[PDB]
């Protein structure tokens, strides 16, 4: 159980920024995407480390229909479905070369990570996330059990607002985490 801490995923960030003030009506105006998320299902944030599927068998495309990538294909009864929403999600500023930092409290290890980034021209404020919209920019091999895992990726030919989609395949069983992070390539 865990998530990408940097660049923070959607639900981790929503928890981090608003967990201490989750019913604040001004969230609507300060962080509208976090607002809609908290409105829909507070557990998307309280259980921020739980965005996984079991028994995907490597078939990520089958498990995650277009427009449901960020929710893990509506995993856990749609718990994270608000992650699929379209709009001005808060971004982390990154360079074209950036570090992914995963935290996993259970130290499951990883068989691999896949890192996809949206193509130039994609607009996350108006368009749902699709497999077409993403290109694979990084692939790792396995990592031993550890609470913190990090590695550097390069996402070429990108500028401004994008989505980084990280697939983390745990080593303890066929459990796969699906981690969307909003970024701004500066
Ligand atoms: Cu776990």
Residue numbers in the entry: 37 to 222
Please give sentences taken from the publication describing this entry.
Lytic polysaccharide monooxygenases (LPMOs) are auxiliary activity enzymes that also attack cellulose, as well as other polysaccharides, using an oxidative mechanism. LPMOs are compact globular enzymes that lack a substrate binding cleft or tunnel, and instead have a copper atom containing active site located near a planar binding surface. Thermobifida fusca, a model cellulolytic bacterium, secretes two LPMOs, the type I (TfAA10B) and type III (TfAA10A). The first LPMO structure to be solved was the chitinolytic LPMO SmCBP21 and more recently several bacterial LPMOs acting on cellulose have been investigated. These structures share a common immunoglobulin-like β-sandwich core fold, a flat binding surface, and a conserved N-terminal histidine.
The structure of TfAA10A was refined to a resolution of 2.0 Å with R and Rfree of 0.167 and 0.233, respectively. There are two molecules in the asymmetric unit with two copper atoms and multiple iodides. It has an Ig-like β-sandwich fold with a copper ion bound on the active site. A histidine brace, a conserved feature of LPMOs coordination with copper, facilitated by the N-terminal histidine 37 can be clearly observed in TfAA10A. An interesting feature of TfAA10A is the axial position of the copper coordination sphere, which is tyrosine. In most AA10 LPMOs and in TfAA10B, a phenylalanine occupies this position. The copper atom at the active site of chain A is 50% occupied and the one with chain B has occupancy of 31%. The active site of chain A has type I copper coordination in agreement with previous studies while the more distorted active site of chain B includes some features similar to type 2 with an equatorial water (wat550) in contact with the copper. Clearly, both active sites have been photo-reduced by X-ray radiation during data collection supporting the assumption that copper(II) is the catalytically competent state. Closer comparison between the Streptomyces coelicolor lytic polysaccharide monooxygenase and TfAA10A reveals almost identical backbone and His144, Tyr213, Trp82 and Asn83 at the same locations and conformations.
